[PDB]
Amino acid sequence: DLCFTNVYADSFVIKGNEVSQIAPGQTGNIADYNYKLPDDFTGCVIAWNSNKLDSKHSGNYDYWYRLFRKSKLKPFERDISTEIYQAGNKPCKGVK
Amino acid sequence: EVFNATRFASVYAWNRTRISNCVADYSVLYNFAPFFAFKCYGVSPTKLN
Ligand SMILES: *[C@@H]1O[C@H](CO)[C@@H](O[C@@H]2O[C@H](CO)[C@@H](O)[C@H](O)[C@@H]2O)[C@H](O)[C@H]1NC(C)=O
Ligand SMILES: *[C@@H]1O[C@H](CO)[C@@H](O)[C@H](O)[C@H]1NC(C)=O
């Protein structure tokens, strides 16, 4: 019985505990570096097991996630970039 | 020294240290930590320095 001026359907595959991670005002590697839901979130998330399409014999590694960002992620912002995280004071560009 | 100990004791007998006469920069804290849980209550970790 509700009307929305717009609807955004953000989709991604994530681990089990990381579902409890995704919520308005949470913390952790995903809640801070990969997906930060805004505190005044008007919307809601959906999660169900997909062990048949994201799994196969010999394993699968197609998916990715970031644990090294220079700061926290502002809500609803993508940070797709491959830059080596600086540790200490040496750039060590090009090589891990 | 606090984060590079070798024998962090058990929870039943928790090691207790004191920090005084310092300049406390937590960048070195962020360095030696593949963090899993930084839930901070009293202060905001971003606004900590
Ligand atoms: C908790 O563990 C700390 C690091 O392992 C201890 O700090 C050091 O302890 C050594 C002796 O183990 C001291 O020589 C050194 O100066 C420094 O204080 C700390 O003492 C220890 N505390 C307790 C209550 O066990
Ligand atoms: C502890 O200090 C030594 C100093 O050589 C260093 O090699 C080691 O990585 C440090 N370990 C941690 C957990 O900080």
XYZ file of C-alpha atoms and ligand atoms in Angstrom:
184
model
C 0.000 0.000 0.000
C 3.023 2.291 -0.464
C 4.273 4.373 -3.387
C 7.947 5.125 -4.034
C 9.204 7.927 -6.260
C 12.142 5.658 -7.146
C 13.609 2.282 -6.226
C 17.284 1.301 -6.349
C 18.111 -2.417 -6.435
C 21.747 -2.906 -5.424
C 22.923 -6.511 -5.777
C 26.045 -8.366 -4.660
C 27.125 -11.777 -3.352
C 28.534 -11.783 0.186
C 29.352 -14.190 3.031
C 27.141 -15.307 5.897
C 28.161 -13.069 8.802
C 28.513 -10.178 6.352
C 24.713 -10.218 5.998
C 24.393 -9.274 9.672
C 27.132 -6.777 8.852
C 24.928 -4.959 6.318
C 22.587 -2.688 8.296
C 22.226 1.050 9.000
C 24.960 2.047 11.421
C 27.259 -0.975 11.508
C 31.002 -1.657 11.531
C 33.579 -3.989 10.031
C 35.527 -4.540 6.843
C 32.446 -4.661 4.579
C 30.399 -2.101 6.524
C 33.253 0.436 6.281
C 35.364 -0.337 3.188
C 32.924 -1.968 0.739
C 29.328 -1.036 1.617
C 28.212 1.544 4.174
C 24.457 1.794 4.548
C 23.466 5.335 5.604
C 22.171 5.834 9.132
C 18.836 7.239 7.900
C 18.298 4.361 5.491
C 14.835 4.329 3.885
C 14.787 0.845 2.404
C 15.638 -2.728 3.274
C 17.949 -5.589 2.329
C 17.248 -9.142 1.133
C 19.435 -12.245 1.459
C 19.077 -15.912 0.501
C 21.471 -18.833 0.084
C 22.977 -19.403 -3.370
C 25.224 -22.456 -2.988
C 24.403 -23.832 -6.460
C 25.246 -20.942 -8.816
C 28.304 -19.530 -6.988
C 29.938 -22.907 -6.372
C 31.449 -25.706 -8.432
C 33.879 -28.584 -8.194
C 37.557 -27.526 -8.063
C 36.405 -24.235 -6.505
C 35.598 -20.740 -7.711
C 37.249 -17.384 -7.035
C 35.443 -14.988 -9.387
C 34.307 -12.721 -6.558
C 36.317 -10.051 -4.764
C 36.253 -7.780 -1.730
C 38.359 -4.926 -0.357
C 39.861 -4.834 3.131
C 42.384 -2.030 2.475
C 41.044 1.487 1.928
C 42.616 4.790 2.924
C 39.464 5.660 4.900
C 35.891 4.575 5.515
C 33.389 4.446 2.663
C 30.809 7.216 2.649
C 27.273 5.814 2.293
C 26.176 4.786 -1.208
C 29.492 5.275 -2.993
C 31.528 2.901 -5.161
C 35.293 2.622 -4.715
C 36.306 0.391 -7.626
C 40.076 0.907 -7.853
C 43.221 -1.232 -7.643
C 45.807 0.803 -5.721
C 48.332 -0.795 -3.376
C 47.679 0.223 0.222
C 50.607 2.206 1.602
C 52.264 0.799 4.714
C 55.039 2.643 6.495
C 56.406 5.355 4.198
C 57.516 3.517 1.041
C 55.468 3.721 -2.190
C 56.672 0.394 -3.683
C 54.641 1.166 -6.793
C 53.834 -1.629 -9.228
C 54.683 -4.603 -6.990
C 53.080 -6.175 -3.925
C 54.788 -3.503 22.858
C 51.146 -3.983 23.883
C 50.187 -5.328 20.437
C 53.441 -7.250 19.827
C 53.379 -9.406 22.948
C 53.845 -13.157 22.596
C 51.715 -14.443 25.509
C 48.467 -12.491 25.678
C 47.064 -14.114 28.804
C 43.739 -15.885 29.150
C 40.490 -14.054 29.817
C 40.269 -15.456 33.359
C 43.551 -13.700 34.289
C 43.637 -10.694 31.967
C 46.922 -8.826 31.620
C 46.489 -5.160 32.575
C 48.877 -2.398 31.477
C 48.823 1.378 31.834
C 49.652 4.054 29.260
C 50.818 7.464 30.488
C 53.214 10.227 29.423
C 52.535 9.738 25.731
C 51.895 11.158 22.354
C 49.265 8.663 21.198
C 49.044 8.280 17.423
C 46.863 5.365 16.376
C 48.215 5.042 12.831
C 50.788 2.614 14.223
C 47.802 0.853 15.804
C 46.070 0.564 12.426
C 49.347 -0.706 10.963
C 49.841 -3.917 12.957
C 46.240 -5.092 12.672
C 44.285 -6.881 9.937
C 41.251 -5.573 11.824
C 38.191 -7.740 12.388
C 36.317 -5.742 15.043
C 36.790 -2.021 15.727
C 33.424 -1.358 17.376
C 34.170 1.750 19.424
C 31.593 3.150 21.833
C 33.030 5.964 23.945
C 34.849 7.642 21.052
C 34.655 7.659 17.268
C 37.689 5.867 15.774
C 37.971 8.394 12.936
C 37.957 11.290 15.418
C 40.423 9.770 17.858
C 43.690 11.652 17.219
C 51.335 -7.523 30.198
O 52.184 -7.831 29.104
C 53.027 -6.729 28.741
C 53.764 -7.135 27.485
O 53.856 -8.549 27.367
C 53.956 -6.380 29.901
O 54.679 -5.203 29.559
C 56.091 -5.453 29.695
O 56.326 -6.472 30.657
C 57.705 -6.790 30.824
C 57.793 -8.007 31.720
O 57.057 -9.056 31.107
C 58.400 -5.554 31.411
O 59.777 -5.833 31.606
C 58.233 -4.361 30.455
O 58.832 -3.200 31.017
C 56.764 -4.122 30.105
O 56.149 -3.585 31.264
C 53.163 -6.130 31.178
O 54.052 -5.998 32.281
C 52.178 -7.268 31.442
N 51.334 -6.956 32.584
C 50.815 -7.892 33.385
C 49.966 -7.391 34.516
O 51.022 -9.087 33.207
C 57.061 -7.507 16.494
O 58.307 -6.832 16.297
C 59.195 -7.499 15.391
C 60.492 -6.724 15.404
O 61.463 -7.319 14.555
C 58.552 -7.568 14.011
O 59.412 -8.275 13.127
C 57.206 -8.275 14.099
O 56.553 -8.225 12.836
C 56.316 -7.621 15.155
N 55.080 -8.374 15.305
C 53.888 -7.802 15.509
C 52.725 -8.739 15.638
O 53.759 -6.586 15.604
